Amino acid sequence: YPYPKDDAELRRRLTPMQYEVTQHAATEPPFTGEYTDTEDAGIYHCVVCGTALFESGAKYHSGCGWPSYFKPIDGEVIDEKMDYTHGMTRVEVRCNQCGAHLGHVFEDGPRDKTGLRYCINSAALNFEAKP
Amino acid sequence: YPYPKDDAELRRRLTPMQYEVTQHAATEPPFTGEYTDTEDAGIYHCVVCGTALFESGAKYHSGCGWPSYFKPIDGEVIDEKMDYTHGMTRVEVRCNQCGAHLGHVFEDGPRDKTGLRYCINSAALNFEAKP
Ligand SMILES: [Zn+2]
Ligand SMILES: [Zn+2]
């Protein structure tokens, strides 16, 4: 990952939730994240490295309990990796710039669009409003 | 449970984490809770109903990532229920007065005491200092 890892800096700058989610692949509980129901126009950036990851225009109502997007801003900003943790097989999504754990992607997204549900922890993101 | 249920009031008074943990059996991520490492003398109360649940004297450093106690204040204050969720069989611990989800109890606690680890979400509790 291009963005250099500096653990000391992250621990100083990130909240415990942000750090655990992004660095230890923790999962914020459903219906507790800041951006779960956000509908404002803008861009969701990696909380770690600031790379733009998701646009408000791709955010949709999934009812799953986390921010949910049907596509990232482009095919380059996300890295996918199989995840066999927690007695499940899933596809983890990471920031391709810095490697931050973001969430998971599922094949139960909008059938009228991409069919994909990018299920992202709020604590992995920071929102830049664009009114 | 005797303590009368008002979801609307809870939604207003509790933070989303406290609400989802106690009412929907969410689990705070490990290493994110406020009280995980707390050593101060005092009493941990149910965040929902205020019942005294655990004493600082029964709190110990388990290293598991959540507040851990080897016994509650007395046996009467906790209800236990088998929990078959999340692909595991565990013993849920609830507040006996209001039914709040608190956490789980495991049999890997200090053998020089109860041998039990009551593993409790910080977000289910509110600490009262008795210094
Ligand atoms: Zn990043
Ligand atoms: Zn209670």
Numbering used by the authors:
A (entry chain A), B (entry chain B): 10 to 140
Quote from the publication.
The Microcapillary Protein Crystallization System (MPCS) embodies a new semi-automated plug-based crystallization technology which enables nanolitre-volume screening of crystallization conditions in a plasticware format that allows crystals to be easily removed for traditional cryoprotection and X-ray diffraction data collection. Within microfluidic Teflon tubing or the microfluidic circuitry of a plastic CrystalCard, ∼10–20 nl volume droplets are generated, each representing a microbatch-style crystallization experiment with a different chemical composition. The CrystalCards are manufactured with materials that enable a balance between X-ray transmission, optical clarity, moldability, chemical resistance and surface energy. This system produces diffraction-ready crystals by allowing crystal extraction from the CrystalCard or in situ X-ray diffraction and structure solution using diffraction data obtained from samples within the CrystalCard.
Using a fine gradient, the crystallization phase space of a particular protein–precipitant combination can be carefully interrogated for crystal optimization or mapped out to show the transition from precipitation to microcrystals to single crystals. Crystals formed in a concentration optimization gradient screen of 30%(v/v) MPD, 25%(w/v) PEG 1500, 0.1 M acetate pH 4.5. The protein concentration was 22 mg ml−1 in 20 mM HEPES pH 7.0, 500 mM NaCl, 5% glycerol, 2 mM DTT. However, 10–20 nl plugs contain enough protein to generate crystals that are large enough to obtain useful X-ray diffraction data. Crystals grown in plugs are typically 40–200 µm along their longest axis (the channel dimensions are 200 × 200 µm). Protein crystals can be extracted directly from individual plugs in the MPCS CrystalCards. Crystals were removed from the CrystalCard using a 0.1–0.2 mm cryoloop, cryocooled (using the crystallant as the cryoprotectant) and subjected to X-ray diffraction experiments.
